[PDB]
């Protein structure tokens, strides 16, 4: 539902 760049960048960098 309109995924933001912020939460994407977060997901990509998450552990």
């Amino acid at each position, epitope marked *: 539902a309109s995924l*933001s*760049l*912020q939460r994407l960048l*977060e997901a990509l*960098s*998450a*552990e």
Partner: antibody
Amino acid sequence: QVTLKESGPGILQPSQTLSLTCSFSGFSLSTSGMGVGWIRQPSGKGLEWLAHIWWDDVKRYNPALKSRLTISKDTSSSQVFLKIASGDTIDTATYYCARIPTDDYYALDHWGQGASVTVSS
Amino acid sequence: DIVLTQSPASLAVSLGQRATISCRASKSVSTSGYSFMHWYQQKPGQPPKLLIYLASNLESGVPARFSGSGSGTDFTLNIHPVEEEDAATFYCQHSRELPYTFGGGTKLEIKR
């Protein structure tokens, strides 16, 4: 309307579990974009991001202490809970909870007045 | 992990004059139209208060004597003109990637 208030032990036994609660009103943690996070500040030292939970229950933790962190939300009661296992002296700090108002950027727009946590024999 | 270095650590400025605070990031915190830098003012005995989001967005209710600039690795907050209530510590914060980190902070002494 927008208030967050931290509640916590005050003093803790080294190796015992630090348990913090963040009650809030003025907004709902089921509103799209909304999130709540924990930042801690030792005495005279800087700021450190611990963890946060988004409106859709996606959780994030500081890798440095990810071993020890557990976060959750009671959307019904408008509360967020943080637990930090094997509590130690260096976990002595002011623990803040703050709101992340949108999906679009992770900044913290409203903070609680803090909750001074000491851990000592 | 992105390390934010604030410059200067301490700054003494007279009323009506200009305080400038650098924040340098060990990696670019800017990509694809976004600069993921944020500024807070922490007064003694209070939590930090948000002044600027995404480098140059003046947070509602905050006066325009707080300006944010910078892009990539090098960011700048100007308090201009400085006032009595700016006797605080100022932090930058990035949300470029996890872990999210703050600078060590910059304390502004008001000269009188």
